[PDB]
Amino acid sequence: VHLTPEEKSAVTALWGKVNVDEVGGEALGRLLVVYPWTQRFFESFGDLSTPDAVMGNPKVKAHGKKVLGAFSDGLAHLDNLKGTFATLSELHCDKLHVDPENFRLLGNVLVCVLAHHFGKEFTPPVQAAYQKVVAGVANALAHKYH
Amino acid sequence: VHLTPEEKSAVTALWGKVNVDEVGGEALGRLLVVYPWTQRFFESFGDLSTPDAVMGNPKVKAHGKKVLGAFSDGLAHLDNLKGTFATLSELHCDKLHVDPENFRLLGNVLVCVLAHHFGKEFTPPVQAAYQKVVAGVANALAHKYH
Amino acid sequence: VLSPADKTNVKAAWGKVGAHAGEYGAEALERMFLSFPTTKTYFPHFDLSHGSAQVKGHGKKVADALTNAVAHVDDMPNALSALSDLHAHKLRVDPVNFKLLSHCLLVTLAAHLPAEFTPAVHASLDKFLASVSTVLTSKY
Amino acid sequence: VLSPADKTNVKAAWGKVGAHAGEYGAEALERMFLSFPTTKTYFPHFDLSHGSAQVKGHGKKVADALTNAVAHVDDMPNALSALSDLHAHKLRVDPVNFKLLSHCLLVTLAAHLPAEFTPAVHASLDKFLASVSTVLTSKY
Numbered sequence: 001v002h003l004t005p006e007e008k009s010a011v012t013a014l015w016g017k018v019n020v021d022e023v024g025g026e027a028l029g030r031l032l033v034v035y036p037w038t039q040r041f042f043e044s045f046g047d048l049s050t051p052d053a054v055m056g057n058p059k060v061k062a063h064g065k066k067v068l069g070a071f072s073d074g075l076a077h078l079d080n081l082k083g084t085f086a087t088l089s090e091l092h093c094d095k096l097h098v099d100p101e102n103f104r105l106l107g108n109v110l111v112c113v114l115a116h117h118f119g120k121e122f123t124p125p126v127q128a129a130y131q132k133v134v135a136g137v138a139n140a141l142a143h144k145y146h
Numbered sequence: 147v148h149l150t151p152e153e154k155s156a157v158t159a160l161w162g163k164v165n166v167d168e169v170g171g172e173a174l175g176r177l178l179v180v181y182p183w184t185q186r187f188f189e190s191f192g193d194l195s196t197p198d199a200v201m202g203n204p205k206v207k208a209h210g211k212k213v214l215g216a217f218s219d220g221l222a223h224l225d226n227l228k229g230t231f232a233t234l235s236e237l238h239c240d241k242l243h244v245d246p247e248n249f250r251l252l253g254n255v256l257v258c259v260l261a262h263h264f265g266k267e268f269t270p271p272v273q274a275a276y277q278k279v280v281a282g283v284a285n286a287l288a289h290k291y292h
Numbered sequence: 293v294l295s296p297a298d299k300t301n302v303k304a305a306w307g308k309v310g311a312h313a314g315e316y317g318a319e320a321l322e323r324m325f326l327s328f329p330t331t332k333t334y335f336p337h338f339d340l341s342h343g344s345a346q347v348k349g350h351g352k353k354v355a356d357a358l359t360n361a362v363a364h365v366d367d368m369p370n371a372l373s374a375l376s377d378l379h380a381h382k383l384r385v386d387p388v389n390f391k392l393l394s395h396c397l398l399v400t401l402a403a404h405l406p407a408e409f410t411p412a413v414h415a416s417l418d419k420f421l422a423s424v425s426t427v428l429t430s431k432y
Numbered sequence: 433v434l435s436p437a438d439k440t441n442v443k444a445a446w447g448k449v450g451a452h453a454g455e456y457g458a459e460a461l462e463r464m465f466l467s468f469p470t471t472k473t474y475f476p477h478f479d480l481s482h483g484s485a486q487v488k489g490h491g492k493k494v495a496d497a498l499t500n501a502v503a504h505v506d507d508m509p510n511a512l513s514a515l516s517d518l519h520a521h522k523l524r525v526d527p528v529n530f531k532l533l534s535h536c537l538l539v540t541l542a543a544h545l546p547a548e549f550t551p552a553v554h555a556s557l558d559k560f561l562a563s564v565s566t567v568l569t570s571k572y
């Protein structure tokens with residue numbers, strides 16, 4: 001985004017320690033649990049009746065990994081999240097009808113998952129840099145809405 | 147911002163009809179009445195106890211004129227709000243300590259005031275152009291916060 | 293909360309809306325769609341063209357519900373329960389959108405009631421729409 | 433609207449915080465100031481530097497009120513009346529900021545209570561902070 005070389009390094013290095021598989025599945029599951037209305041787009045996934053049911057749902061887990069994957073690829077284009085997510089932005093608008101506010105909710109869930117995971121390592125300054133990243137991503141994804 | 151050529155004309159045409167002195171006083175007064183918490187910044191202004199006290203306060207009227215005056219200048223530099231508003235942005239942050247959310251509140255009140263004044267002439271699409279404008283100004287004014 | 297004065301202000305202003313409530317509801321929706329395009333994601337099944345009958349139809353429904361909240365200003369949570377359930381459990385509209393519609397309803401009223409849309413009334417209507425929004429989102 | 437499970441979840445989690453609540457209070461503020469620099473506008477009279485005694489002290493203050501609220505989970509409106517007053521009539525913090533502090537508190541708890549920060553506990557804590565925010569801004 002408007003990341004300082006120092007802030008850039010901090011993001012980049014923590015990320016290299018992330019198991020996208022597990023983080024993606026937990027971020028997406030936590031979202032469905034903490035903000036239950038987000039479940040409106042995943043009725044076809046199955047039983048989301050309980051935290052246990054969501055956290056366990058493999059369709060949820062696999063969707064999470066796909067989301068974090070694309071997210072992960074975007075950290076490589078931090079100077080152009082806009083151009084990196086242009087097609088995905090059109091898709092979420094035009095095909096999926098996803099309110100971009102959801103992009104913000106996920107961002108924040110993501111940050112709680114990273115903290116959960118890295119405890120100590122996820123310092124105030126490291127969170128500040130991540131907050132700038134999730135905001136930039138949400139903004140890029142919302143960019144082609146009309 | 148993202149103002150189509152035709153949104154910029156609509157913005158400009160209406161603004162030509164506005165009495166900045168009056169709209170300025172009305173918008174500022176209404177803000178202090180609708181969101182009383184915003185009064186925190188004007189305790190030197192005197193009596194703000196009731197709506198008549200606010201709306202008719204000579205200091206509120208004078209201040210509103212100042213604010214809308216700065217805003218009208220912004221409308222002639224729609225291309226560079228950030229540049230236009232930089233010193234003002236710095237001042238609001240560093241000297242005044244005004245939470246930037248106040249700028250969005252003011253923006254919305256202004257739109258209601260324009261609706262109030264122009265009636266039917268404030269069409270849905272004219273409102274959409276002004277919404278983009280007030281957001282831009284609020285964003286430009288928050289750009290130098292740190 | 294709504295004070296006695298707020299209540300009088302709302303019944304008075306809404307009183308003037310009268311038979312135009314429906315039309316004003318439709319207009320507030322159209323304003324919202326144009327200014328806050330992200331709100332369209334909730335109406336993928338609607339013809340959102342200018343003068344869409346769906347919008348007109350929808351406008352009336354929203355206006356009838358507001359009229360109903362004014363009529364039961366001392367029992368809103370109960371008068372709107374059903375609607376609260378609907379939004380919480382079926383529509384699942386993200387909370388932030390309520391503030392956008394409110395805002396557009398305020399613009400429409402301002403544009404149509406020049407004489408009644410005083411500062412005091414403006415303040416009362418804003419608190420009123422916030423309360424209706426709170427109720428509708430209470431069961432989320 | 434906190435369910436019995438939620439109150440249970442909150443009482444448990446907070447239970448583990450114990451003697452560290454003040455420190456978490458302080459760390460949450462520190463994360464807020466760094467992540468959402470606009471929040472600093474409300475503390476121009478504080479030294480916002482890392483490990484500042486003012487922030488530390490304030491962190492304690494915030495923690496204690498949260499503790500008092502867990503203890504009166506059932507009577508929040510009442511246990512926090514004075515705080516509701518202070519914020520509405522004196523401090524006048526814009527309501528959007530309450531969501532920023534709440535978020536930073538979650539992050540803080542996550543980072544320090546790995547085992548206890550389950551998805552269900554996370555959901556409960558979120559609702560609690562939301563409830564607390566509502567109370568604190570109820571007299572605006």
Ligand code: HEM
Nearest residue numbers: 038041042066067068070071088096098102103106137141
């Ligand atoms: C970090 C932000 C996000 C990213 C990078 C992202 C990315 C993706 C990707 C790469 C796909 C694959 C679909 C395809 O290519 O055809 C997808 C699908 C989808 N996303 Fe997003 N997404 C994000 C946030 C969200 C959120 C927050 C929601 C809803 C709560 C959401 C709802 C969906 C849905 C419903 C689909 C379709 C899945 C299917 O076809 O079953 N997305 N997203």
Ligand code: HEM
Nearest residue numbers: 184187188212213214216217234242244248249252283287
């Ligand atoms: C459209 C957004 C705004 C613009 C263009 C604007 C512009 C200005 C200008 C030109 C001044 C005088 C600068 C000086 O004293 O050197 C000023 C002062 C001030 N503004 Fe802003 N303003 C805006 C919004 C607001 C809002 C929403 C608030 C608070 C709710 C606010 C609070 C103040 C205060 C407290 C002062 C100083 C008053 C005094 O002289 O004691 N401004 N503003």
Ligand code: HEM
Nearest residue numbers: 331334335353354357358375383385389390393424425428
């Ligand atoms: C305080 C404001 C609101 C009021 C009074 C209101 C009221 C209503 C009513 C009366 C209905 C029709 C239910 C029925 O069929 O009996 C409805 C449906 C609906 N509302 Fe809400 N609503 C409000 C806010 C919103 C917002 C902000 C959105 C999204 C931006 C929204 C999205 C919907 C949708 C998608 C439907 C279903 C429409 C259909 O398919 O016919 N509502 N609302």
Ligand code: HEM
Nearest residue numbers: 471474475493494497498515523525529530533534564568
């Ligand atoms: C989680 C919700 C919050 C709680 C429980 C809370 C609690 C408190 C407490 C216990 C005090 C000290 C009262 C005293 O000195 O006797 C206080 C003061 C204060 N709070 Fe709130 N607060 C909350 C949210 C916020 C937020 C979001 C802000 C601003 C961004 C804020 C700004 C202030 C300020 C500026 C003071 C005065 C500090 C001083 O001058 O010492 N509070 N709050």
